[PDB]
Amino acid sequence: KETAAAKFERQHMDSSTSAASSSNYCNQMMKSRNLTKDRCKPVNTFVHESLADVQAVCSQKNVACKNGQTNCYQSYSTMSITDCRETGSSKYPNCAYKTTQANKHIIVACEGNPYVPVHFDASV
């Protein structure tokens, strides 16, 4: 099956654009990345950076995750991100999202060898 690392890339990475370019970004990306196939995922974040720069966060500032695990890491620099949040008119299978662009530090959980991001915890 799909690995956790591959799932992180599919859910969270968009190195092909520098920022969201329209209000439709989230609607298109949530669909195209198969995040709405079984249900409308309520929230998601996309990161507009190179994969290598995001993978490198696993060697940056170790912090507790929101749930208390200690395999989380905060990026030293801010990154370009897009937050996607379900709107009041969303109704499966026509899932609908508000797009918000931001520049924030990211917090990810890392696992494995090579030690890579497997979960997006927060932006701060």
Q: What ranges do the domains of the chain cover?
A: 1-124
Q: Which of 47, 84, 119, 120 is catalytic?
A: 119
Whole-angstrom Cα distance, residue 9 to residue 117?
A: 9
Could you tell me which of 75, 76, 58 has the C-alpha nearest to residue 122?
75
Active site residue 12: yes
R_g over Cα of the chain: 14
* Preceding peptide of 42 cis, ω within 30°: no
Token pair in block for residue 85: 């949040």
Q: Which residues define the annotated binding site?
A: 7, 10, 41-45, 66, 85
Reference 119, options 15, 3, 37; nearest CA is: 3
Residue with tokens 């170790």: 62
- What is the Cβ-side half-sphere exposure of residue 112, based on CA atoms within 13 angstroms? 13
List, as residue ranges, the binding site for substrate. Answer: 7, 10, 41-45, 66, 85
Return the CATH architecture of domain 1-124: Roll (3.10)
Technique that determined the structure = X-ray
What is the stated resolution of the deposited model, in angstroms?
A: 1.1
Question: By the 8 A CB rule, do 67 and 84 touch?
Answer: no
Contact between residue 7 and residue 116 where contact means Cβ atoms under 8 Å apart: no
8, 9, 11, 12: the catalytic one is 12
